[PDB]
Every structure is written in C-alpha cells, then in structure tokens.
C-alpha cells in the first residue's frame, strides 16, 4: 500500500506513469540531482530505458527489486547500489543499459546524440574512470570529424577499447577492426600530445 501511495504522488494525471514533472519531484525528494550517477543506477534497476519516465510496472518492479516502498527506503539502498554497479558483470550490464536508456526510441533513433553519448559516457564511468576517457570525451566535444551520433556497436566496443589500450597507446593497432572513430581519435590524440 505504501508503494501505491508513493507511486500516486509522482504519477502523471493522465498516463499511468511517472513523466518529467513527477520524475523531477521524485529526484528532489530523494535529494539527488536528476542527472547524477545514482539516478542512472535507479533507472537501471527499474529497467526504464526511456529517459524521464517510469511506467507503473517499472516503478513497482524496480521498487520491489530493491526492497523499498518509500523515499527513505530507496535512499538507504544507494550505497549498496553503488557497490553493486562496481562488480564486473553488473557494470557490463549497466553499461549496455545506458546506451538503450540514452536512446530516444520515441522517434525513434538508432544512435545516441553525440552530446548525450558524451554525458552518458562520463556518467556511466563515474566510479571507474579509464585512463583514456578524459581525452576521448575532449575529442568528441571538439568533434574533429563531424559525426552525428554514436551507434550501438561503437558504444559496445568502446568498453573493450578502454581495457585494451592506454595510457600508453602501446597496444593500439590501426589494422584492428575497431570502429573507425577509434582511429580518428588515436590520430587526434597523437596530434594533441605533439602540440603539448
């Protein structure tokens, strides 16, 4: 019953779901910035994949999954959610979810907007910044080669990339079947080391 009352207070007047107005109040009550890492973890746990929305089922299944029926109960889980997201297999799952989440399927697109990709990459790696992440994100904001978005395979293979190479770049082969964007980046990153 507490869960029903909790849902009802953020729920949309018309739809059977939490939309943006509720989502914002919901994060406010959690005392959490709406764009911060714990909120990504929550969306992950609730299996949302549509930004700024929790359907009735996602909210109920997600609250049940973390054993909370209250604002205070959810907050109490945060530290263990943070811990969970650090385990190797959970992280891979959170990482795959993060692409789908950032993806506007309402249109819908098949690629992430460059800037969402940049924000989500920063967010998802919160607890574990790989050596190559700072420059990779500098490279993308500059966007030397004018890409429109980030596809599912580029997102997918980026994780392995971060594990294979750097800080040295000694394990990078231009000959390897990496998405070509990775090569564009390695060049760009060689140039900036020069100009440095």
């Amino acid at each position: 019953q507490r869960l029903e009352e909790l849902f009802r207070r953020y729920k949309d007047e018309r739809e059977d779901a939490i939309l943006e107005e509720g989502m914002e109040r919901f994060c406010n009550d959690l005392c959490v910035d709406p764009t911060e890492f714990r909120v990504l973890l929550l969306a992950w746990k609730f299996q949302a994949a549509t930004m700024c929305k929790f359907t009735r089922k996602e909210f109920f299944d997600g609250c049940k999954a973390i054993s909370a029926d209250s604002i205070d109960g959810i907050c109490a889980r945060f530290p263990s959610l943070l811990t969970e997201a650090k385990q190797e297999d959970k992280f891979k799952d959170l990482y795959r979810f993060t692409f789908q989440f950032g993806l506007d399927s309402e249109e819908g697109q098949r690629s992430l907007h460059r800037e969402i990709a940049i924000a989500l990459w920063k967010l998802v790696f919160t607890q574990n910044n790989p050596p190559v992440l700072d420059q990779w994100l500098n490279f993308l904001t500059e966007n030397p080669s004018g890409i429109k978005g980030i596809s599912r395979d580029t997102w997918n293979m980026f994780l392995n990339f971060t594990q294979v190479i750097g800080p040295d770049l000694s394990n990078y082969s231009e000959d390897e079947a990496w998405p070509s964007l990775f090569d564009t980046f390695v060049e760009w990153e060689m140039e900036r080391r020069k100009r440095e």
């Binding site: 943006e20 914002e24 709406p34 764009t35 930004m51 700024c52 950032g102 969402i116």
Partner: peptide
Amino acid sequence: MLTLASKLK
C-alpha cells in the same frame, strides 16, 4: 535524466 531540463521547458 539528461533530457529532463529540456523536457520541462
């Protein structure tokens, strides 16, 4: 919720 701010405007 990266798109929340835009969606609220």
